[PDB]
Amino acid sequence: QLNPESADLRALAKHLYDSYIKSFPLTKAKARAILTGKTTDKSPFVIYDMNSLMMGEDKSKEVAIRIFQGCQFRSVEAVQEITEYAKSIPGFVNLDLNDQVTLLKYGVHEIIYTMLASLMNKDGVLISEGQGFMTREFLKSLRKPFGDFMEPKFEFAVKFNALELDDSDLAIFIAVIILSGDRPGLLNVKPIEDIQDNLLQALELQLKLNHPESSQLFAKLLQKMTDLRQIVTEHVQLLQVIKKTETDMSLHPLLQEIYKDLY
Numbered sequence: 380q381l382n383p384e385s386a387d388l389r390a391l392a393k394h395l396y397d398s399y400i401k402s403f404p405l406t407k408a409k410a411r412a413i414l415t416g417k418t419t420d421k422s423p424f425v426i427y428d429m430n431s432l433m434m435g436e437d438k439s440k441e442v443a444i445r446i447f448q449g450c451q452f453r454s455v456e457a458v459q460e461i462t463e464y465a466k467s468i469p470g471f472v473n474l475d476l477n478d479q480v481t482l483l484k485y486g487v488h489e490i491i492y493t494m495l496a497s498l499m500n501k502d503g504v505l506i507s508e509g510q511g512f513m514t515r516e517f518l519k520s521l522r523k524p525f526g527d528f529m530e531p532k533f534e535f536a537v538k539f540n541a542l543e544l545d546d547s548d549l550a551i552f553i554a555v556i557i558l559s560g561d562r563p564g565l566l567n568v569k570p571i572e573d574i575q576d577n578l579l580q581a582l583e584l585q586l587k588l589n590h591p592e593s594s595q596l597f598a599k600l601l602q603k604m605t606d607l608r609q610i611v612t613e614h615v616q617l618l619q620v621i622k623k624t625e626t627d628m629s630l631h632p633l634l635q636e637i638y639k640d641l642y
């Protein structure tokens with residue numbers, strides 16, 4: 380049953396999905412098509428060891444560092460994409476500029492792991508825009524403290540992926556994440572909360588329409604925000620270890636600024 384209020388929520392859902400498609404070149408639908416073999420043309424090259432890795436660059440420093448810095452570079456790009464998406468969220472750019480920065484500072488990593496789940500199955504992760512696939516085992520076999528960095532992301536991904544969200548659901552969910560009025564140091568919480576409220580209403584309707592047979596999906600999805608926050612905490616601690624153990628390893632300033640005084 381459609382009414383004018385439901386109609387505005389659908390309109391918002393459509394706008395967010397449209398903006399999501401425009402902002403994120405590699406969607407879940409593409410990632411799944413690559414992962415599941417809808418394919419002769421979308422076949423990833425698979426990196427599972429040093430040789431395959433060495434063969435990969437065809438399609439300077441220690442291996443773990445190269446992978447970690449490759450992972451950091453994609454994060455920077457993901458931040459850029461998520462920032463572009465944030466601006467499309469109605470009301471977002473009208474917020475106090477300090478709050479805009481705060482929302483992004485705290486939101487982007489949670490979004491990164493949400494969307495990274497789209498690129499994952501239990502066996503590994505799509506890399507280089509889906510051209511490559513790096514196995515979970517190969518990542519886990521990396522010298523300490525690098526063998527540990529991706530494992531919590533995979534753990535989250537397999538459980539998050541069981542919700543079977545599609546991109547149209549995800550567009551609203553990551554907008555909800557960004558407009559969190561509970562971020563530290565926010566100047567004006569009310570206008571953020573009002574937008575989140577609307578986004579939440581939109582997400583709820585979207586899940587009810589897109590997944591009618593999936594009971595309490597909305598609640599189950601919101602509960603995942605806990606898993607995301609914990610992933611972020613561990614990551615930052617692991618980064619502190621890296622800083623001290625790999626003094627010769629540069630961290631991208633954008634990421635360094637984001638990490639500066641997190642929770």
Ligand SMILES: COc1cc(CCc2ccccc2)c(C(=O)O)c(O)c1C/C=C(/C)CCC=C(C)C
Binds near residue numbers: 436450490495529
């Ligand atoms: C294992 O983590 C890597 C490593 C890499 C580096 C793999 C690599 C390393 C050395 C030489 C060739 C390839 C990439 C990449 O290059 O695209 C990558 O996308 C990832 C995925 C991980 C992330 C945290 C990126 C998050 C991305 C999104 C939310 C869209």
